[PDB]
Amino acid sequence: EEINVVRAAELHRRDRFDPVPQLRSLMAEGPLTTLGTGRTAWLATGYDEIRQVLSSDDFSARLLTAAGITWPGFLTQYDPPEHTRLRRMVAPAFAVRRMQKFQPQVERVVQDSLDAIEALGGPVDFVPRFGWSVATTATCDFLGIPRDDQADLARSLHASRTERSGKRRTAAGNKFMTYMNKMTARTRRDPGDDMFGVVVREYGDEITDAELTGVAAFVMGAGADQVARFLAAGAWLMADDPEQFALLREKPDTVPDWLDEVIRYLTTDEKTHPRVATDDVRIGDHLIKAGDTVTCSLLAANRRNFPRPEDRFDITRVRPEHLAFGHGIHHCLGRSLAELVFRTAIPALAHRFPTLRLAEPHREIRLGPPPFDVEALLLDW
Amino acid sequence: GIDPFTMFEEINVVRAAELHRRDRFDPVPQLRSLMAEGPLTTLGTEESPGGRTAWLATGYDEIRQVLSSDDFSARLLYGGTAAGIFLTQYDPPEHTRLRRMVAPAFAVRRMQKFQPQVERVVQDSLDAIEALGGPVDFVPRFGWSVATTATCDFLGIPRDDQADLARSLHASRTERSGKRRTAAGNKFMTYMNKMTARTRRDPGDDMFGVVVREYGDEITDAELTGVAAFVMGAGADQVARFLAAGAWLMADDPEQFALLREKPDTVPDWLDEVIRYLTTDEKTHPRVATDDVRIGDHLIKAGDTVTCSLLAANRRNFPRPEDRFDITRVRPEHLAFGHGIHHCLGRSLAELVFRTAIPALAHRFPTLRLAEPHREIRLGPPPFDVEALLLDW
Numbered sequence: 001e002e003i004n005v006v007r008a009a010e011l012h013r014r015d016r017f018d019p020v021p022q023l024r025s026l027m028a029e030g031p032l033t034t035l036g037t038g039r040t041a042w043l044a045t046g047y048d049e050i051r052q053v054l055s056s057d058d059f060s061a062r063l064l065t066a067a068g069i070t071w072p073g074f075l076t077q078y079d080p081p082e083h084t085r086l087r088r089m090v091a092p093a094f095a096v097r098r099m100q101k102f103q104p105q106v107e108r109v110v111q112d113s114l115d116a117i118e119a120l121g122g123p124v125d126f127v128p129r130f131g132w133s134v135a136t137t138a139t140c141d142f143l144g145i146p147r148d149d150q151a152d153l154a155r156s157l158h159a160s161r162t163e164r165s166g167k168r169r170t171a172a173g174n175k176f177m178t179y180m181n182k183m184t185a186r187t188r189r190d191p192g193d194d195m196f197g198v199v200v201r202e203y204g205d206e207i208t209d210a211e212l213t214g215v216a217a218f219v220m221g222a223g224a225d226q227v228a229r230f231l232a233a234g235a236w237l238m239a240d241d242p243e244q245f246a247l248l249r250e251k252p253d254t255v256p257d258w259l260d261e262v263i264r265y266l267t268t269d270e271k272t273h274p275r276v277a278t279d280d281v282r283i284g285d286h287l288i289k290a291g292d293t294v295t296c297s298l299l300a301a302n303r304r305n306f307p308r309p310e311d312r313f314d315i316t317r318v319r320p321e322h323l324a325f326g327h328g329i330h331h332c333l334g335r336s337l338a339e340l341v342f343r344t345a346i347p348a349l350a351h352r353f354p355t356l357r358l359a360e361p362h363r364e365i366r367l368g369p370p371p372f373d374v375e376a377l378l379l380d381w
Numbered sequence: 382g383i384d385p386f387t388m389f390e391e392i393n394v395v396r397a398a399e400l401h402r403r404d405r406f407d408p409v410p411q412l413r414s415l416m417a418e419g420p421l422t423t424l425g426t427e428e429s430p431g432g433r434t435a436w437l438a439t440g441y442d443e444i445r446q447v448l449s450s451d452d453f454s455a456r457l458l459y460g461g462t463a464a465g466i467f468l469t470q471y472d473p474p475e476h477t478r479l480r481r482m483v484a485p486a487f488a489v490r491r492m493q494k495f496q497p498q499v500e501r502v503v504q505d506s507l508d509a510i511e512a513l514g515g516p517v518d519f520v521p522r523f524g525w526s527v528a529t530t531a532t533c534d535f536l537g538i539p540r541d542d543q544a545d546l547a548r549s550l551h552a553s554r555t556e557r558s559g560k561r562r563t564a565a566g567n568k569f570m571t572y573m574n575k576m577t578a579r580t581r582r583d584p585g586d587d588m589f590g591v592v593v594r595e596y597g598d599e600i601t602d603a604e605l606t607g608v609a610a611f612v613m614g615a616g617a618d619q620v621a622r623f624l625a626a627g628a629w630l631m632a633d634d635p636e637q638f639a640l641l642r643e644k645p646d647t648v649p650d651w652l653d654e655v656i657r658y659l660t661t662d663e664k665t666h667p668r669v670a671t672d673d674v675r676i677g678d679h680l681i682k683a684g685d686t687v688t689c690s691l692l693a694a695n696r697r698n699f700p701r702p703e704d705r706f707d708i709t710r711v712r713p714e715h716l717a718f719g720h721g722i723h724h725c726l727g728r729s730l731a732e733l734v735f736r737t738a739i740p741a742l743a744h745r746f747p748t749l750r751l752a753e754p755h756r757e758i759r760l761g762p763p764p765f766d767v768e769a770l771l772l773d774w
């Protein structure tokens with residue numbers, strides 16, 4: 001049953017922004033297909049069926065010991081009621097009011113990230129200078145990491161995930177986590193105006209150091225990876241189809257749902273973590289036996305009408321429907337922060353470089369392994 | 382979010398734990414298969430240039446090589462994990478410096494002196510079981526009763542205090558509520574801080590007084606407290622789980638333990654065989670490679686991790702006849718207490734408790750049996766955790 005998680009990864013590659021032919025074949029086969037098999041690994045590609053799976057109380061997101069021991073603060077490895085307690089304690093850091101009040105700082109992050117790019121001059125790689133820069137600075141600011149330490153903290157996170165020397169990965173992972181631990185200690189003594197502080201002032205000794213460090217490490221990792229990769233993919237979409245984003249730039253009021261369409265089209269997290277069934281559960285016409293796993297294809301759901309015309313990127317589309325942030329109890333806790341950064345950074349780029357385009361538009365943009373990972377994006381203006 | 386499969390240390394801890402579940406007393410088929418493959422196999426690899434590999438060592442000699450090598454670190458793994466937040470987290474020189482100061486408390490002469498007290502603890506626990514009447518759960522009534530009392534006596538906690546103090550320590554590590562964790566932790570700490578202050582005024586006969594006499598200045602209060610908490614928490618857990626699994630083995634194979642009770646001098650190494658067969662701590666903490674090392678027919682790169690299967694080493698000939706429990710086996714070999722600089726500090730205490738309590742049980746209840754012979758015994762997550770053991774006699 002473990003090879004079936006490798007198999008899922010293969011189906012979520014991309015032909016530029018499009019899903020690959022292998023996935024399309026499964027999509028047209030039906031809403032729910034077998035990946036492998038008396039236990040069965042299923043892929044859910046139907047919009048309705050995915051929602052049924054992700055919102056059912058007869059599935060667990062657990063791999064298998066209590067989540068808190070090996071995965072403290074890694075929410076998508078908790079089941080209720082432990083999941084419910086921990087998510088309740090961190091959720092107020094992501095409430096609408098705190099997100100609105102964060103918006104001015106996120107605006108400055110994008111403006112300064114754009115001030116650096118213009119000074120450097122075209123052409124220039126937007127993967128590090130726009131994607132990575134905005135994402136890590138915004139996420140560090142949200143956590144209250146002092147500005148003087150962010151560059152080195154962000155460098156150690158990146159090195160821990162990508163370094164070509166395994167030895168240097170270990171050292172960087174240790175550097176990163178020690179810093180997150182020290183942040184937890186400073187909050188416990190003197191809670192500030194940030195995620196750490198908000199959690200500790202509301203709950204205090206109810207949340208443990210392991211939980212708090214765990215959640216903070218997760219938010220840093222999610223913020224740095226998810227937001228950076230999305231912003232890189234957004235800049236590429238801007239370069240590829242600039243007339244649609246000129247409409248955003250000049251007449252944003254006529255396209256109030258624009259961000260949902262970009263999210264739908266790009267789908268930079270293509271699939272959810274496998275869910276294991278705990279009762280026999282009818283899902284559509286299909287029977288999922290207790291012990292089966294179901295992986296949900298968020299790409300399949302959001303791009304369900306590919307390759308027909310209506311699936312093509314249309315920024316004026318009325319109320320775009322997507323499941324890009326999942327569904328049910330594990331739906332993305334960070335959605336409001338991610339969306340704030342995208343709402344701010346994407347139009348800030350359009351206003352700043354209306355004449356944005358690919359430097360070297362002859363050659364293909366190289367993509368890494370999924371999830372959707374633009375490795376370099378050389379743009380001029 | 383974050384894909385849990387990209388969490389290198391955590392995902393491979395999980396995979397290693399799954400491999401060290403048990404089918405009654407035996408290794409599961411999945412570990413058996415890896416054992417047959419060779420002395421070292423992969424748990425998993427990060428899929429990128431520079432990606433690290435998590436390895437499982439199952440070969441006896443290869444495990445001794447890994448664990449005696451200076452090119453592996455215990456500290457560097459848990460420092461890259463949110464899960465990693467006493468002695469096993471240290472490398473030399475910190476490891477050496479702390480371990481030398483506490484080692485005198487676990488010396489041979491010290492265990493000889495404690496033996497009469499351990500005999501009394503066993504007899505008291507067995508009297509209480511007898512007074513309850515069958516069927517009795519041997520997990521709380523034999524395993525934990527003996528483990529808690531013997532470990533607290535070793536620390537010199539007065540009998541009146543032991544129940545409350547052990548409860549406090551367990552609360553602080555256990556509860557979901559983090560408020561009750563801090564309250565219980567502070568109750569434990571305030572007691573130990575007084576005990577430390579008392580010891581430093583006049584060193585006594587227990588663990589604290591021995592240490593403070595030989596190394597009083599050079600060891601801190603926090604270090605003393607930390608060692609006590611390990612002995613009372615994790616140490617006691619290890620001992621309780623072993624005694625519960627021992628009692629199960631005795632009920633399961635009464636004829637071999639009848640040999641222990643009637644002709645104990647014919648089976649001088651009996652305890653080494655019981656320990657080998659049961660292997661109630663199935664694996665070591667994962668170590669990070671700090672240099673490249675060739676082991677088996679593989680190259681472990683610096684930054685790769687290795688987890689050693691003590692179960693695999695101890696049960697290396699499973700399922701052949703020679704691996705079966707045989708209390709008369711001459712000089713049984715095992716690595717149940719690890720190897721190299723991190724080898725069990727409490728081995729001699731653990732063995733004294735087992736050497737005393739197991740014969741005591743065999744003599745008291747020669748008719749010991751499962752209460753519900755056909756009902757399966759439920760095992761918790763690794764390490765070897767008998768959840769309930771209803772015995773009668």
Ligand code: HEM
Nearest residue numbers: 075076219222223226269272273325326330332333334382
């Ligand atoms: C600062 C940015 C982000 C943070 C802090 C964040 C945080 C989280 C957290 C904590 C969860 C787990 C919630 C739970 O289990 O209860 C989660 C789940 C999820 N996030 Fe995010 N996230 C971020 C950005 C993104 C982005 C940009 C996407 C997609 C484009 C995304 C997609 C998801 C999905 C699909 C899940 C559900 C996973 C599943 O059910 O298996 N996240 N996120």
Ligand code: HEM
Nearest residue numbers: 468469612616619662665666717718719723725726727731
């Ligand atoms: C009163 C009982 C016990 C105490 C106080 C105790 C104490 C300790 C301590 C302090 C260490 C760390 C040593 C270091 O890093 O230098 C250790 C390691 C170890 N102990 Fe124990 N122990 C006890 C019982 C047991 C039992 C019953 C077993 C097995 C059946 C066991 C197996 C181990 C193993 C395998 C290690 C090494 C782990 C590794 O290298 O990663 N111990 N013990």
